[PDB]
Amino acid sequence: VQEVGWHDVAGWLGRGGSMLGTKRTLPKGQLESIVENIRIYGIHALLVVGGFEAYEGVLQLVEARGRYEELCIVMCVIPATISNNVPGTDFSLGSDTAVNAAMESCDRIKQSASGTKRRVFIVETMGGYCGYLATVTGIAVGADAAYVFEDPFNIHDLKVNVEHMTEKMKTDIQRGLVLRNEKCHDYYTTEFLYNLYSSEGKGVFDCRTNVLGHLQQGGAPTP
Amino acid sequence: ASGAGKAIGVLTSGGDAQGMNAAVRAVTRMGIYVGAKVFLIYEGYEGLVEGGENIKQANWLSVSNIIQLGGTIIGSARCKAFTTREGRRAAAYNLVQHGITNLCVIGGDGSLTGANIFRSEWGSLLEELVAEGKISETTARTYSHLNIAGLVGSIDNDFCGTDMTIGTDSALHRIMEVIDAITTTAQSHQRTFVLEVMGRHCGYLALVSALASGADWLFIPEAPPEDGWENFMCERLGETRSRGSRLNIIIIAEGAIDRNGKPISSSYVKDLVVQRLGFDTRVTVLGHVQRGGTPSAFDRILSSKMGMEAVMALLEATPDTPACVVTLSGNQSVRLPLMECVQMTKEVQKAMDDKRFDEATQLRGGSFENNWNIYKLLAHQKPPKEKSNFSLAILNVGAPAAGMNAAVRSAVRTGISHGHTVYVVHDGFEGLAKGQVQEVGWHDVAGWLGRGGSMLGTKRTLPKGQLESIVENIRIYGIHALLVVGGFEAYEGVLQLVEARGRYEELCIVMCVIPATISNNVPGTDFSLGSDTAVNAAMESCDRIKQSASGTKRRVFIVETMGGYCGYLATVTGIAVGADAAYVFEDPFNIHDLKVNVEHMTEKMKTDIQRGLVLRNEKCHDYYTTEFLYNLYSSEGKGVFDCRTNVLGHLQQGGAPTPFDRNYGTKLGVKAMLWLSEKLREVYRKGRVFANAPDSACVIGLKKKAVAFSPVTELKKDTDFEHRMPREQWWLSLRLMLKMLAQYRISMAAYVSGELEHVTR
Amino acid sequence: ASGAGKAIGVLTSGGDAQGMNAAVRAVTRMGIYVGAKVFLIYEGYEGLVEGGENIKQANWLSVSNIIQLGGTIIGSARCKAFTTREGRRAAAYNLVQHGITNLCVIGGDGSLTGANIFRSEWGSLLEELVAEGKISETTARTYSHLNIAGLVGSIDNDFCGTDMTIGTDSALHRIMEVIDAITTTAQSHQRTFVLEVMGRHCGYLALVSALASGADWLFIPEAPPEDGWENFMCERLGETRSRGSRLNIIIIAEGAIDRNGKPISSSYVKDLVVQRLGFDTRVTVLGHVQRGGTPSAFDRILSSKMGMEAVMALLEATPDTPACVVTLSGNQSVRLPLMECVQMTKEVQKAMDDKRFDEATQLRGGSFENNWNIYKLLAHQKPPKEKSNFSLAILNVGAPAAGMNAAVRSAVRTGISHGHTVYVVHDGFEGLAKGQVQEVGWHDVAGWLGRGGSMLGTKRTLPKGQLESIVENIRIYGIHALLVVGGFEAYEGVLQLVEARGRYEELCIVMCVIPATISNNVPGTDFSLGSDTAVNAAMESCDRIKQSASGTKRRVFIVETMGGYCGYLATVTGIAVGADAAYVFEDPFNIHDLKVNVEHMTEKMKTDIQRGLVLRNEKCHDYYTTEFLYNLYSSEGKGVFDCRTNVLGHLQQGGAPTPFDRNYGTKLGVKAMLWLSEKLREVYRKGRVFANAPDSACVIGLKKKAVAFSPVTELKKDTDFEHRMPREQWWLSLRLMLKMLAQYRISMAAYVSGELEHVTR
Ligand SMILES: Nc1ncnc2c1ncn2[C@@H]1O[C@H](COP(=O)(O)OP(=O)(O)OP(=O)(O)O)[C@@H](O)[C@H]1O
Ligand SMILES: Nc1ncnc2c1ncn2[C@@H]1O[C@H](COP(=O)(O)OP(=O)(O)OP(=O)(O)O)[C@@H](O)[C@H]1O
Ligand SMILES: Nc1ncnc2c1ncn2[C@@H]1O[C@H](COP(=O)(O)OP(=O)(O)OP(=O)(O)O)[C@@H](O)[C@H]1O
Ligand SMILES: Nc1ncnc2c1ncn2[C@@H]1O[C@H](COP(=O)(O)OP(=O)(O)OP(=O)(O)O)[C@@H](O)[C@H]1O
Ligand SMILES: Nc1ncnc2c1ncn2[C@@H]1O[C@H](COP(=O)(O)OP(=O)(O)OP(=O)(O)O)[C@@H](O)[C@H]1O
Ligand SMILES: Nc1ncnc2c1ncn2[C@@H]1O[C@H](COP(=O)(O)OP(=O)(O)OP(=O)(O)O)[C@@H](O)[C@H]1O
Ligand SMILES: Nc1ncnc2c1ncn2[C@@H]1O[C@H](COP(=O)(O)OP(=O)(O)OP(=O)(O)O)[C@@H](O)[C@H]1O
């Protein structure tokens, strides 16, 4: 714990990531150390800027108020995560940056055929089980499909989408793009969809794959 | 051999050209790699004067994680004290107090002029210093000679002896990012975009920007406009409107003047256009934006190379050799004496001061005059009253590469200018067999500069299968020359058509290969058209990935790059991003080398540096795939760092061309057409073109120093067709620089540095 | 410590018990590992007598690729010369010519009797040899003591002091393969299968075969049938028919006799059955088939262990210690003096010659008498006039394991014999919660011995979730005891019920866990029921996989075995198959170890051995997966050997139980039911059963020497619940033998060998 001043945060606006360290560890395991440090430093309020782990940890401290008197302090959670998976808000802080980075990657990928070859790209986005990032990114890029956990899909839906893509690909449009959330399906992975689209699209289109890993993460924040 | 027992000083002065940090990093790390002590002089000549706290010895971690930063972490300052001997003597004192007999100065023309005057007076300054009693006679006989290696760090490119300077490419990246904001939009209404660049003294940035953007008009101080240009410009914009072209671009340098000394302001040109044309005219002034942003890939590689060569030149320099500037003319490293470059800079300044003003542009360098002539030729269609019966077909073969369109545009305009009947064939050899030949005009290539990929279709299919169809279509369309813009497939196909001259009379036509591919695997060139774009997109993704760990988690990223078996893209990207290791096919590695690198990474990761980055070429190893390296690094790094993987697929492919690629493809497209026309006249006989010698089918080069024409049959010896790459690649020496910058103790006796060369008049 | 400067002779004599080659391999490779010279004596005592060419020094490759071969590469012969002193003196001479003061004899009872008489006369033979002038007095004071370490290699198991001999398990594999050919077929008509085994002197093979097959009747020389057995047998077959049982199995040893000396021929029993019953009776005589085939997994492991221990016992043996026989009683290695074992063999032979004939069966060993009592109890339902209010439920929990059905069959019969009300619950704890409880009878488990998998369903679901349903069903059905046959889930579930006794009074019931799993990962035992089957299936696949490269081709196979985090299956399979390495979780390995082992394999593959084999436990490493090891071995072996991968999935799972697994599950199921009955009588008080102490919930063991009962609460300390295995496993010392037998220089100072023990009367 370090007391901070006005100028200690100077120029923190445009810096992505976290000047302060981030850890995912929830407070329940080391709760005795947390209450001790709160007592030592006289912390009367707590402003937790973070993702679902921030919200869950603050929930754990609230439920542990009954055991520890010191945890009866005002707490506030600022939802800050790429996935936009934090309950209580519509836009987690930094989801917009991730969406912008994801579409820029998808726009570059969709431009990589350059109007000659007709090709479908399976782009895999992050976000855990939360599909928000995939779906909005699919809207922004005109993706044909955005497979997400919240909309469970089976092989019948996949055949419908693949036939739809094949029919579209015979028309004037030549660059297809289907997004897949990393945890949308247990078995129909990105490799599965690559095999499916490339097999069924034989003689019509080629298929390629690009797993956007931390390309959606480390960018500077959008305005 | 090693420079042990001697100390090197590195300073930056003048405008903070982005890429200075790359040069400082390479200078520092090479200096302490060869055992010398490196001293960082903060604020340039300022801290040289005051000294004391401003001079600190560097360690390896002092220049850690700065290569992607623009500006200069050392800092730069304008000081008038170094102008006068009072402060220059204090500078010499502070250098002697640290035993710094070796100085690397990274700065513009004024910086290097000050360094030249500082060497020229170093003996006199030491004499006056010992005379005044601030240093004993002993300790002054040593340090009697000061070694100066200059690096031109500036966006102006005003230093006459040098062709390319650090930060010029990145300033061009900023400029073209702004211009692409305008041009890539769906142009909706008639508007005029007037761009003002800071080229107050030198108009090189204004010129290359105009060439890269296809500006309608250019105001540069080197060639002021003729009297009555007001009407001439307004009429040019008028017919531009009548064509239906909805956007006019006016690039006005800050130093824009008329034939007299009166400057032309951007606001004046704005109000002029508004008054006579009524177009929505708004002036965009970049200002500080040109010096801003990250350094481009080119700037990082070239700054690192020149910083290393500066240090090496600084150790092999005896008392007799003069102050030098380490620079690259073309792709070749070279050292030029500081005195001659300063003298040429003074001559051009005097010439520009209304002495030999019309003949000052030639003394600026042949590149400037050639660039301005190419710009004017491509800008406005002059009437080609000359005509020739020749006709030529432009092919795009292989993968798409950023900058093919720029080459095709220049080829079309230049060929039309020479009166040739220019055709474009869609889909390369497929269309040539299928007769997809389309006669092209001047305006059919309008706005092709900034478009990435290929506007003509690209196909990889070699011509051998459909050779009867290709010769039939050459006969039908009367094709006398064949311009093939593409990758290894382009070269290989031209090689097949040349070999088939033995069988088919119709293939006895002049052929030219413009190497255009991401992999840079085309023999006969150093830079395939669009390799620069791929490198820039590759580092930007790698920089994003390296920034994602956010300064706290210790993480290594395995980043898999494209390039086939050709490792060029992987290695240069590793240099640009400070990758720990760039595994490539041309440097075979076994598990012993992997354990060496992994233990090296673990040791590095226990220190202050927390973000590791290893690159893997997609086809470097049969078994040690990206997943293999992931498993290795994550297991051995257990309890120290985590490992992640990212296969940069076609992220490296579909980008718009970088400004280098546009200008490069523009120029060699012009040169290819010049060479085609000259070879066609040389070969026209008895009423027909009959080109059968092997020198009538060449790959346009840029092989070491200038553009070359290597015959494909001669290149076949040095071509590995199985791996689709040349057998001897110029860039393998850059592995040593990568490994040295990553603390790998590699005996780099195989690295060759540029030797001294006098200025070319 | 090492036995350098001394030579070890190894010979084989008597019937060629399969697994002899494994013992010879281990003796040889230990003797040259410790620096001793190993001399192979061909044809046994024959080549001992003639000597000369028949005595050859062994190298490492002398025993290469022999462990899977039955018989003996050394060769055995019957020689009468060793009976007489004329040839025995020549044998002592030939040993002295090579300086072989140490002899390991692998043979049957006659072989070891000859070895005993040879040691007893070694001093006298040397005295007479120097007296006759064939050796000087010097060179005879050295070698004055001959060290003998015996190994019982025979299918008879006639050596009384020893419980298990090399080749007994494999002879049983042959016998049961023949019986399973009959029983697994859809039995269509009433037929009688009379199997004649070669147990001419010892009826142990006949007995254990009958126990494993559930023979209707048994003729063994140890217990000849009573007078009037003709009618009693024919009636037993008669009620067998009346039951609808369509196959009768009569195991008649070659040495089958009546109470007089008249032998009972298989043809007589055939004609007897034909005359009174009319069943299709055919006599199967195995003859040489018993000694044939590959050695079983058990035979290879135990032969390797005993051969290693024979060498070690031979180096730590001073002039005073007597000749010993290295054997295992239970799972514990032990050394027994040769003289006492020979004396016991003579006593039992005299007893069997109508001296103490009714009391000869006990002197054969308690295991024989216990096996015969278990056989007779399970064979025919005698009327249980005793009754008890106790009722017990039999569960199958975890994965299916070969031999669960045998255990359940024996538990059912033994419980019915003791008057208990035996329930079986289908699907384990799921059924107990769901009330899938079905009372079972004697004939409901008929023919469950040879059935693989689990007749009762198995489920992995632990009882904590549905504990209310379990206690409810225990109350409804009045279940006073719980017999849980299964893997780690069985032990963990019984532990959960024991821990929940404090909450629920009904759970205070006597519980017993029979460890039955493939992984052998259950704490409290050395061998889980069905681990032997998995090991045997694993080696058979590995032998096939090793057999597949042929002739010139040098190839390594990475075989992945199951077993979870428990490495037992991988390591024993590696010993059985001569695997170079068995990567397991309990022996953590990094890339340094992998490079060592890969270079080791490469150097081996440059020698004349061409088929390497390494095993990988499925969960040995998080990152160095089977694909990783495939990539590593194939890359480093480039130009030396090829690499291939085979993941033995459920090939190790579904096989029918081996004869060991059948007999083991039979015996411990009986023993578990005996222990349950004793505990339930000791705990019945106040008119109800109340089992609250920790001792009432035990895992039946066989932990070192004999069967044990470890309380589950006490075993909780030595259980790694995250990895589902015990913390201290007995078999980690076998890694040292594996690595030693693969030329890995591993200091096995942590290995403990069995010490001298006198015979148990
Ligand atoms: N994106 C960035 N990444 C890293 N460092 C940065 C970034 N932006 C600014 N900085 C650094 O932060 C320092 C803080 O000074 P800065 O001028 O940028 O903010 P400030 O105007 O003084 O404070 P304030 O936010 O209240 O306006 C700068 O010197 C600069 O080096
Ligand atoms: N003739 C000279 N003698 C001594 N010192 C000089 C001379 N010219 C310039 N300097 C020193 O070099 C410093 C920077 O030089 P300058 O003003 O020309 O910028 P620059 O190097 O040319 O970079 P840029 O062109 O981009 O603006 C000056 O502040 C001055 O201290
Ligand atoms: N795109 C342009 N940008 C700037 N100036 C231009 C451009 N085109 C023509 N000019 C200027 O207009 C003047 C006359 O143009 P024009 O080409 O029609 O006649 P010219 O005799 O051929 O001149 P020159 O050959 O020397 O370039 C030239 O001096 C030139 O500097
Ligand atoms: N990145 C781009 N992608 C697609 N179309 C583009 C791009 N840039 C410009 N264009 C299109 O090219 C068209 C031609 O006009 P453009 O301004 O680009 O060139 P021009 O000035 O008329 O002739 P020139 O290329 O010789 O300079 C424009 O209308 C515009 O729609
Ligand atoms: N009492 C004995 N004294 C000396 N040598 C003996 C004696 N018994 C057996 N041998 C020797 O050991 C050799 C093998 O013995 P034997 O024929 O009896 O078979 P075994 O050792 O008992 O094993 P198995 O019966 O299974 O084949 C014989 O050839 C004989 O030379
Ligand atoms: N399955 C069997 N195989 C071989 N012998 C058997 C079998 N069953 C019974 N016998 C033998 O037949 C004899 C009489 O059998 P039975 O069990 O019915 O009467 P018993 O008085 O109880 O004899 P015992 O209990 O000692 O074996 C016994 O000596 C027994 O050894
Ligand atoms: N591996 C097997 N798989 C399936 N059924 C089997 C297998 N082995 C035996 N059986 C069946 O068990 C049935 C019961 O008769 P079986 O001959 O096998 O023994 P049993 O006399 O009835 O009882 P006991 O266990 O005492 O020997 C047979 O009809 C046979 O079909």
Ligand SMILES: O=P(O)(O)OC[C@H]1O[C@](O)(COP(=O)(O)O)[C@@H](O)[C@@H]1O
């Ligand atoms: O845990 P959050 O809040 O969902 O953070 C999102 C990020 O974490 C991730 O799970 C990836 O984290 P890691 O790189 O450490 O494996 C992605 O979903 C995303 O990049």
Ligand SMILES: O=P(O)(O)OC[C@H]1O[C@](O)(COP(=O)(O)O)[C@@H](O)[C@@H]1O
């Ligand atoms: O074959 P070239 O001329 O090197 O083309 C470069 C491109 O081709 C590649 O091999 C991959 O192309 P594809 O995705 O179409 O299969 C990469 O090296 C790179 O993206």
Ligand SMILES: O=P(O)(O)OC[C@H]1O[C@](O)(COP(=O)(O)O)[C@@H](O)[C@@H]1O
């Ligand atoms: O849980 P256990 O007792 O270790 O059973 C071993 C078997 O379970 C396994 O995990 C596989 O089980 P499944 O086939 O059902 O997935 C293997 O380790 C092995 O075949």
Ligand SMILES: [Mg+2]
């Ligand atoms: Mg300047």
Ligand SMILES: [Mg+2]
């Ligand atoms: Mg015998």
